[PDB]
Amino acid sequence: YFINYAIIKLKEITSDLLIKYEREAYLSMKKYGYLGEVIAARLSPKDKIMNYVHETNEDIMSNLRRYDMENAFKNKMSTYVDDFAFFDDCGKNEQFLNERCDYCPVIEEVE
Amino acid sequence: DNDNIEQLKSMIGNDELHKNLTILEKLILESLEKDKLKIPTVQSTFHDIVKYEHLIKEQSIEIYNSDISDKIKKKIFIVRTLKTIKLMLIPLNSYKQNNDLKSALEELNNVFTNKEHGTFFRKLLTHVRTIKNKGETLILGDNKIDVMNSNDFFFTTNSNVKFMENLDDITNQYGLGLINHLGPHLIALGHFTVLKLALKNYKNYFEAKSIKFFSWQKILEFSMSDRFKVLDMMCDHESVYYSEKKRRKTYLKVDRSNTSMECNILEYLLHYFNKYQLEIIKTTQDTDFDLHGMMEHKYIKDYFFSFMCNDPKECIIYHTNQFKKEANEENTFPEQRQISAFNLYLNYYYFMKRYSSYGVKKTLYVHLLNLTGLLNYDTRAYVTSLYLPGYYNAVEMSFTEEKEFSKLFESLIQCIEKCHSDQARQISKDSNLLNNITKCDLCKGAFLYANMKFDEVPSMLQKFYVYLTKGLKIQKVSSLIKTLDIYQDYSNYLSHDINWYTFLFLFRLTSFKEIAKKNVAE
Amino acid sequence: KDVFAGFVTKKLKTLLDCNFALYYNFKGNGPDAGSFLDFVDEPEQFYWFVEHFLSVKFRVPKHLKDKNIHNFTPCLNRSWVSEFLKEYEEPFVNPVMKFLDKEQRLFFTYNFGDVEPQGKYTYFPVKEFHKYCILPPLIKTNIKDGESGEFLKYQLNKEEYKVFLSSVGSQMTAIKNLYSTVEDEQRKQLLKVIIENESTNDISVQCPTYNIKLHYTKECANSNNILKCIDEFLRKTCEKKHPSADLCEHLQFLFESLKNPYLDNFKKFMTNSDFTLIKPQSVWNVPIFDIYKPKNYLDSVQNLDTECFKKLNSKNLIFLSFHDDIPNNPYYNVELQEIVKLSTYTYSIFDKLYNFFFVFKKSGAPISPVSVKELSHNITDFSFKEDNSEIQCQNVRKSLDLEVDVETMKGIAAEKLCKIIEKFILTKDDEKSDIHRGFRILCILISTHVEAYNIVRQLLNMESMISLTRYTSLYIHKFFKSVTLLKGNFLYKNNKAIRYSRACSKASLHVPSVLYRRNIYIPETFLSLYLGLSNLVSSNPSSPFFEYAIIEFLVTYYNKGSEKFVLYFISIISVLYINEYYYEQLSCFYPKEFELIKSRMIHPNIVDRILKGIDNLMKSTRYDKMRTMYLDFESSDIFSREKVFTALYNFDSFIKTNEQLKKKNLEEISEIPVQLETSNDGIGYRKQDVLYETDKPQTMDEASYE
């Protein structure tokens, strides 16, 4: 990550750029900071995962602590600007393009 | 129409394959001389090495310390190559002399024939209703013997040829003689099942050209979903070609019934070569190294070699910086001609004297070296692949039922209680190669391979089940796979005897939830 | 050829009364009372009913097929309008509105009796006013019950909310001030566990939305802005039965609690017409409303009412405030649809490809899928396609430059595809014209070149990971969905551009889907060109089944009658030309940078064995129906290697020309609204609350938990 930041944004450095990289970040930090006021109002309590993540049963508490350690490095250090723009049209084969995680295992309901 | 008979010559008469095996066997027979633990010559027969294997097991059980068991576990894995090599050199010798593919494959049938029972289960069926319930593997003989009472706890028994010939005889009797000599080795069992399928339809594949045949080296070379579509051309399957879903779904919606069970071992193995192709990719991922399973196989060979050496030319892996990144090891090989990366002199030299000293990351770069090369129709990596443990260990990942170990054993009984009525007086006496394998040949074969009590030295279950219940305090079979505290022990426990893997292969294929009313691979 | 006199023939009403019977039963729950559209008063409700029902040919959806309601079978493959324009001479729109409202209200009374039909409303969300909460809010926590999977959820009431406002302290103090007032032990225990778990678990106060329902065209006709419009709506209701009777109760309740300053200005608000209570909380962008097509009624995550016809978007937020200001932004303005004739309104919508389904049912034959046994004999070679040869430079022309930034390449691709629509509208100004043949190839190829241009930039390590553009067609799809309503473009309010805009929006949806297919086995994202394609057909280009696997995948969409068949068959062939493109560009001209991607691409001679193989397999006796249905709805431009490359060599020379005008910013695409800084006046956010929380220090008594 950092070499990919050392190459590009730290290529040219002057005094004018140092103020320039600040407010370019700060407005995005205010933009990234504005997301939590947006998303949290539209949340619902009944998610099948958020009941499961915040469990306190020690048999469930240990199934997650192995999971996030094993599934740690499948995540990446990349921030996407296109994370919240969604495709309005849904092809049923193409319903995955809404989701936008790196590690997207298919979860299938068996009844 | 020429590529049926031509592709079989890679199975049967490839002189590059015969050159690579004799390279391996000369390495093996020089490595059996130079052992500090203690011998067949090159021109010995297959039945020598069978009688030589049980000598080593009679030599290895008695001199089993906990301190020398690296030298023991190699000299078991060495032999179960050398037994397969002297089995694999049976057609390559005969086709080089006789130049006939039929008579060459006859030399395999003339081995496994070895040209030369109803009272048991009636005692069992009364025994189940007196039970009817975990007390069947826990009979009074197992009250004496607990977790690790003696050296015999890891092996078959206390080093009897008469015990080890009973397992030789029973799998010969119940049609499972192919499995027991090879192990569940993902290549050697796959190779010799295709050859078992070669004589079974020698008029259909050959001299009439109606059904398309493939070598086993080619089916490994294809992509992940392309293997089953190649396998469906091998047998007489018919289905929709393009399947968006997984293989494990669209296979079931065709009603595959009255299938040859030689074809159902291969569908097992391609399902566990797929889940071996993932688990080398899923565990070797680092930064600037993102492999994918459907990647083109000349590029995985390109990308993996351009990863560990910064030159994309195929370098020696065992001397690069990346193989030494986990831990600093030393750099010894005597021929330091450019040395090519898939060299049998090289890859067997580190497996002998450095493979016990590898961590988990250094291990996987050996198997990823030999998962590529399999994907590129390299005979050198094919011959390399016989002495790796990793192709044996694919049946370890098979266990995914969360039920107890006794509930898998009741489903083994539940087959036999149906199989006891299904006797149509089809008598299996020798494991031929013209023959089929029925489901009764598989359920009775595994159960009599498990519960073999000789000299009151406990059976294969009563050493394994006691290792689970009173040794790891585990009730659920699926908990062997999660929690690396359990698993890194459990792949050391099984790897004493290859016949554990042969047991689990016979125990996984027979203890399905739904084996009672449906096929094996179904 | 008859002048329209209000009389209906037997054939049209059988189409017409069916077209209601689909739409009122479109939920499948039965006939629905909210589904009524007033045609006479509002034209936009009428033209929406023209588009999705009347102008297109009839078709029963899959979920309606099991429902089995009033007889669709004589009237399946027939459209109402094309019959109606053929029988009768073209009328003005106003006698049509009386004619269809007369039929509809009889259909409504036949299904609902003496219920007065009302127009389908336009929804407006209002959450918070002046950073206060307009309703009794909701408390959300990360606490979890052991009795229930669901978190702790405490919803306030009206009488509790008076105490919740009069607290000077923060939100944490407000719930503590609330705890004295509350009188139920089943509430007090429910509030105690929230306050007790404060330091360990989140507590946030979240308001509910109130939706302002109103007839849009009836109310907002005379008002200048939508911001001006709701004010003229609320003054009707406070002075005054409309279903906004809730809100004017809630205002007078809440302004009673906000005692002196906020009740007076609200009481002054009903007098002065200069006042605006309705003020934008967010910077508004296109579109203003989202117009809900009937598919959106079925989606459970949307959870739409039947009465939703237009909602003010999540991009566009309204908050009631006295003090704040209205910026200068043109999208506040009331935009009404032009009342246009039934003739021209169809041809601005009418697309030839969306009748692919009716060609397949009438004059198309279902193709049997390839059985694997028949697949064995139809192929001869099983050797693998392999070529590692280095490409000769002298046949190729360097049109590709990698120094151009990706966010600029989003801008150039939209600007270049605005010009192709600009040339197709104006040069073919001459009544049943379709989209031109070159379109849906130029929409897909040019989006495919920039989609690969991400993957080339991300592999070369040249793009910053701070702003990685994930899907570039997403910039294309959001742009051409709303390009006609967007200022600053030649396509602004251009009715000919609508069916060119909607087509390139849907065609660019299928572009990244080909390039990003997560495999069914491996669930990872990836930076490759062919790994997207290889996961789609479940085979590799080195494998000899790859020619069959592409076409046999298209047989899946073909036998369904799917319109997506033409769009995909453009896409997969275009991806193969891309792999020829960059591998010819990079191997000759960027020989260092070529080395990192040479494993991520296909050699073009390997692509040629595929493309020579596909074109032969399309002419085979099994697949003759595939080729003919494609050429009905597209031209065979994509089969040529050379005309496609010139369409790419045009775009990659377009960058070298239009690099002058790269300065224009990307028009924003996110669903999340752009922030407008409002005056801090909230419960936690008063100036009084800043000094009150400094007045009490952090007491050692409470941190001891006593």
Tell whether A42 is within 8 A of chain B (Cβ). no
The span from the CA of C354 to the CA of C563, in Å, is 6
Output C43-46 pairs: Cβ under 8 A, ≥24 positions apart.
C43/C93, C43/C97, C43/C217, C43/C337, C43/C339, C44/C216, C44/C217, C44/C336, C44/C337, C45/C119, C45/C120, C45/C309, C46/C97, C46/C100
Q: Transcribe C279-307 into DSSP letters.
A: EESEE--S-SEEE--GGGGT-TTT---TT
Helices (H), C460-603: 472-481, 498-507, 510-515, 530-537, 546-559, 564-589, 591-597
Tell whether B209 is within 8 A of chain C (Cβ). no
Buried b / exposed e over B15-42, threshold 16 CB at 10 Å, is: eebbebbebbbebbbebbeeeeeeebee
The span from the CA of C41 to the CA of B183, in Å, is 81
Buried b / exposed e over C658-670, threshold 16 CB at 10 Å, is: eeeeeeeeebbbb
Q: Calculate the CA B212 to chain-centre distance.
A: 25
Q: Which candidate, B317, B309, B312, B311, places its Cα nearest to that of B371?
A: B317
Q: How many helices (H) and strands (E) does chain B have?
A: 25, 0
Buried b / exposed e over C90-107, threshold 16 CB at 10 Å, is: ebeeeebbebbbebbbeb
The span from the CA of B342 to the CA of C357, in Å, is 55
Residue with token string 């898998």: B408
Here the tokens at position A20 are 């320039």
The span from the CA of B346 to the CA of B369, in Å, is 12
- Asked whether the beta carbons of residue C471 and residue A97 sit closer than 8 angstroms, the reply is yes
The span from the CA of A96 to the CA of A74, in Å, is 18
| CA distance, residue C551 to nearest chain A CA (Å) | 17
- Asked whether the beta carbons of residue A66 and residue B483 sit closer than 8 angstroms, the reply is yes
Specify whether the CB–CB gap between C480 and C504 falls below 8 A.
yes
Q: Checking DSSP bridges between strand C282-283 and strand C674-675, what pairing results, if any? A: antiparallel
- Asked whether the beta carbons of residue B285 and residue A73 sit closer than 8 angstroms, the reply is yes
- Asked whether the beta carbons of residue C465 and residue A77 sit closer than 8 angstroms, the reply is yes
Specify whether the CB–CB gap between C269 and C230 falls below 8 A.
no
Taking CA atoms, B289 is separated from B281, B331, B360, C358, C593, in Å, by 10, 24, 17, 49, 17
Interface of C with B in 382-421 (CB under 8 A): 382, 384, 386, 388
Q: Which candidate, C446, C442, C463, C445, places its Cα nearest to that of C454?
A: C463
Helix axes C498-507 and C472-481, enclosed angle (nearest 10): 160
Q: Transcribe B6-50 into DSSP letters.
A: HHHHHHHT-HHHHHHHHHHHHHHHHHHHS-S-----TT--HHHHH
Q: Which candidate, C241, C265, C262, places its Cα nearest to that of C253?
A: C262
Here the tokens at position A68 are 């996030």
Coarse DSSP helix, strand, coil percentages of chain B, rounded to the nearest 5 percent: 60, 0, 40
Q: Across the interface, which of C474, C513, C564 has its CB nearest the CB of A85?
A: C474
Phi, psi of C386 (to 5 degrees): -140, 125
The span from the CA of C455 to the CA of C526, in Å, is 9
Helix axes C604-618 and C546-559, enclosed angle (nearest 10): 50
- Contact list in C for residue A79 (CB cut-off 8 A) is 465-468
- Asked whether the beta carbons of residue A80 and residue C518 sit closer than 8 angstroms, the reply is no
Here the tokens at position B178 are 């192919």
The span from the CA of B183 to the CA of C500, in Å, is 64
Tell whether A78 is within 8 A of chain B (Cβ). no
H or E element that contains C132: strand C132-133
Is residue C24 classed as helix, strand or coil in its secondary structure? coil
What Rg, from alpha-carbon coordinates, does chain A have? 19
Give the count of beta carbons closer than 10 Å to the beta carbon of residue C656: 10
Neighbours of chain C (3+ CB pairs under 8 A): A, B
Neighbours of chain A (3+ CB pairs under 8 A): B, C
Is residue B201 classed as helix, strand or coil in its secondary structure? coil
Give the count of beta carbons closer than 10 Å to the beta carbon of residue B59: 15
Helices (H), B282-359: 297-308, 344-353
Specify whether the CB–CB gap between B501 and B494 falls below 8 A.
yes
Is residue C653 classed as helix, strand or coil in its secondary structure? helix
Interface size, chain B vs chain C, as Cβ–Cβ contacts under 8 Å: 109
Specify whether the CB–CB gap between C134 and C211 falls below 8 A.
no
- Asked whether the beta carbons of residue B241 and residue C369 sit closer than 8 angstroms, the reply is yes
Sequence-separated (6 or more) residues with CB below 8 Å from residue B378: B342
**Exposure of C589 by Cβ count < 10 A (0-12 exposed, 13-18 middle, 19+ buried)?**
middle
Is residue C556 classed as helix, strand or coil in its secondary structure? helix
Specify whether the CB–CB gap between A73 and B282 falls below 8 A.
no
- Asked whether the beta carbons of residue A73 and residue B482 sit closer than 8 angstroms, the reply is no
Q: Which residue of A has its CA nearest to B244?
A: A93
Sequence-separated (6 or more) residues with CB below 8 Å from residue C73: none
Q: Which candidate, B6, C466, C497, C282, places its Cα nearest to that of A6?
A: C466
| CA distance, residue C114 to nearest chain B CA (Å) | 52
What is the longest distance spanned by two Cα atoms in chain A? Answer: 64
- Which one-letter DSSP state was computed for residue C54? I
Buried b / exposed e over A28-45, threshold 16 CB at 10 Å, is: eeeeeeeeeebeebeeee
Buried b / exposed e over C498-537, threshold 16 CB at 10 Å, is: ebbbbbbbbbbbbbbbbbbbbbbbbebbbebbbbbbbbbb
Q: Which candidate, B191, B235, B195, places its Cα nearest to that of B212?
A: B235
Tell whether A54 is within 8 A of chain C (Cβ). yes
- Asked whether the beta carbons of residue C522 and residue B223 sit closer than 8 angstroms, the reply is no
Helix axes B460-469 and B405-419, enclosed angle (nearest 10): 150
The span from the CA of C19 to the CA of C72, in Å, is 9
Sequence-separated (6 or more) residues with CB below 8 Å from residue B364: B280, B283, B284
H or E element that contains B92: helix B79-98
H or E element that contains C356: helix C356-363
Neighbours of chain B (3+ CB pairs under 8 A): A, C
Residue with token string 């691979």: B521
C contact test, residue of B292, B314, B375 with most C CBs within 10 A: B292
- Asked whether the beta carbons of residue A79 and residue C468 sit closer than 8 angstroms, the reply is yes
H or E element that contains A30: helix A15-33
- In DSSP terms, B47 is beta-bridged to none
Resolution (A): 3.7
Show the 3-state SS of C413-456.
HHHHHHHHHHHHHHCCCCCCCCCCCCCCCHHHHHHHHHHHHHHH
Here the tokens at position C430 are 């001459």
Q: Which residue type is seen at C93? A: V
The span from the CA of C352 to the CA of C56, in Å, is 11
Sequence-separated (6 or more) residues with CB below 8 Å from residue B94: B103, B104, B107
B contact test, residue of A65, A70, A93 with most B CBs within 10 A: A70
Q: Transcribe C231-260 into DSSP letters.
A: HHHHHHHHH---TTHHHHHHHHHHHHHS-S
Tell whether A35 is within 8 A of chain C (Cβ). yes
Specify whether the CB–CB gap between C173 and C162 falls below 8 A.
no
Residue with token string 């099983």: C382
Is residue C375 classed as helix, strand or coil in its secondary structure? helix
| CA distance, residue A54 to nearest chain B CA (Å) | 21
Q: Checking DSSP bridges between strand C278-280 and strand C122-126, what pairing results, if any? A: unpaired
Q: Across the interface, which of B245, B281, B298 has its CB nearest the CB of C520?
A: B245
The span from the CA of C263 to the CA of C238, in Å, is 13
H or E element that contains B131: helix B118-131
Q: Checking DSSP bridges between strand C122-126 and strand C310-312, what pairing results, if any? A: parallel
Q: Which residue type is seen at B70? A: D
- Contact list in A for residue C669 (CB cut-off 8 A) is 82, 85
- In DSSP terms, C333 is beta-bridged to C225
The span from the CA of C503 to the CA of C2, in Å, is 35
The span from the CA of B114 to the CA of B110, in Å, is 6
| CA distance, residue B382 to nearest chain C CA (Å) | 19
H or E element that contains C11: helix C10-23
Q: Which residue type is seen at B229? A: K
Here the tokens at position A63 are 């199934």
Q: Which candidate, C277, C282, C281, C272, places its Cα nearest to that of C228?
A: C277
Output B472-475 pairs: Cβ under 8 A, ≥24 positions apart.
B475/B404, B475/B405
The span from the CA of C197 to the CA of C152, in Å, is 11
Here the tokens at position C443 are 């929409």
Interface of A with C in 67-96 (CB under 8 A): 74, 77-91, 93-94, 96
Q: Checking DSSP bridges between strand C278-280 and strand C310-312, what pairing results, if any? A: unpaired
- Cα torsion angle, B384, B386, B388, B392, sign: positive
Here the tokens at position B472 are 């790891």
What Rg, from alpha-carbon coordinates, does chain B have? 23
Q: Across the interface, which of A34, A51, A89 has its CB nearest the CB of C149?
A: A51
The span from the CA of C297 to the CA of C26, in Å, is 9
Compute the half-sphere exposure of residue B112: CA atoms within 13 Å on the CB side of its CA: 30
Q: Calculate the CA C654 to chain-centre distance.
A: 29
Report how this structure was experimentally obtained.
Answer: cryo-EM
Taking CA atoms, B384 is separated from B28, B51, B73, B215, C559, in Å, by 12, 24, 18, 18, 47
Specify whether the CB–CB gap between C533 and C572 falls below 8 A.
yes
Residues of B at the A interface (Cβ-Cβ below 8 Å)?
244, 285, 482-483
Terminal C-alpha separation, chain A: 43
- In DSSP terms, C155 is beta-bridged to C138
C contact test, residue of B296, B311, B377 with most C CBs within 10 A: B296
Specify whether the CB–CB gap between C283 and C300 falls below 8 A.
no
Phi, psi of C18 (to 5 degrees): -70, -40
Specify whether the CB–CB gap between B53 and B180 falls below 8 A.
no
- Cα torsion angle, C456, C459, C460, C464, sign: positive
Sequence-separated (6 or more) residues with CB below 8 Å from residue B43: none
Give the angle subtended at the CA of C458 by the CAs of C455 and C464, to the nearest 5°. Answer: 140
Buried b / exposed e over B236-265, threshold 16 CB at 10 Å, is: ebebbbbbeeebeebbeeeebeebbbbbbb
Is residue C466 classed as helix, strand or coil in its secondary structure? coil
Compute the half-sphere exposure of residue B319: CA atoms within 13 Å on the CB side of its CA: 13
Q: Across the interface, which of B244, B285, B482 has its CB nearest the CB of A66?
A: B482
Specify whether the CB–CB gap between B412 and B403 falls below 8 A.
no
Specify whether the CB–CB gap between C472 and C413 falls below 8 A.
yes
Specify whether the CB–CB gap between B412 and B504 falls below 8 A.
no
Q: Which candidate, C47, C198, C5, places its Cα nearest to that of C705?
A: C198
Helices (H), C90-184: 93-112, 158-166, 171-181
- Which one-letter DSSP state was computed for residue A35? H
- Asked whether the beta carbons of residue B296 and residue C371 sit closer than 8 angstroms, the reply is no
- Asked whether the beta carbons of residue C469 and residue A46 sit closer than 8 angstroms, the reply is no
- Contact list in C for residue A78 (CB cut-off 8 A) is 465, 468
H or E element that contains B419: helix B405-419
Q: Calculate the CA C672 to chain-centre distance.
A: 13
Give the count of beta carbons closer than 10 Å to the beta carbon of residue C561: 16
B contact test, residue of C386, C522, C559, C605 with most B CBs within 10 A: C522
Q: Which candidate, C277, C289, C278, C285, places its Cα nearest to that of C329?
A: C285
- Asked whether the beta carbons of residue C525 and residue A85 sit closer than 8 angstroms, the reply is no
- Asked whether the beta carbons of residue C470 and residue A80 sit closer than 8 angstroms, the reply is yes
Residue with token string 């297959």: B46
Q: Rounded to 10 degrees, what is the CA torsion of C477, C480, C486, C489?
A: 130
- Asked whether the beta carbons of residue C505 and residue A78 sit closer than 8 angstroms, the reply is no
Sequence-separated (6 or more) residues with CB below 8 Å from residue C335: C288, C485
Here the tokens at position C651 are 């775009």
Q: Calculate the CA B96 to chain-centre distance.
A: 27
H or E element that contains C205: strand C203-206
Q: Across the interface, which of C465, C470, C516 has its CB nearest the CB of A4?
A: C465
Specify whether the CB–CB gap between B76 and B60 falls below 8 A.
yes
